[PDB]
């Protein structure tokens, strides 16, 4: 199944799969570079 995976068929000695567990949080104040977005209003629940 083409989009229901985590890793291509390279098991058969290679990768441990890098999991990207998406847990997004909002970016409230104004003005954003590449950096400061994810450390704006982190309500760490």
């Amino acid at each position: 199944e083409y989009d229901g995976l985590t890793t291509a068929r390279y098991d058969d000695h290679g990768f441990l799969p890098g999991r990207e567990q998406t847990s997004k949080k909002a970016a409230v104040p104004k003005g954003t570079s590449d950096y400061q977005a994810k450390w704006y209003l982190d309500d760490v629940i």
Partner: protein, 71 residues
């Protein structure tokens, strides 16, 4: 709401007189929109910066991108 006029330093001090205008301010690249009020008193415009994709001590997921998959 006025326009986000840009300003690109880290040791410059704003004086409170100007209730009702907007200036975009240096955060490393971009220009944080500030509706300028007497709600900042002698502190840096370039203090608006914590410039990193955050320090991974609780979720260390980008450290997993530097390790070794191996043939």
């Amino acid at each position: 709401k006025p326009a986000p006029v840009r300003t690109h330093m880290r040791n410059m001090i704003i004086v409170p007189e100007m209730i009702g205008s907007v200036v975009g301010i240096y955060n490393g690249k971009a220009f944080n929109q500030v509706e300028i009020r007497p709600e900042m008193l002698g502190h840096y415009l370039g203090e608006f910066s914590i410039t990193y994709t955050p320090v991974r001590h609780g979720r260390a997921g980008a450290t997993t991108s530097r390790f070794i998959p191996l043939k």
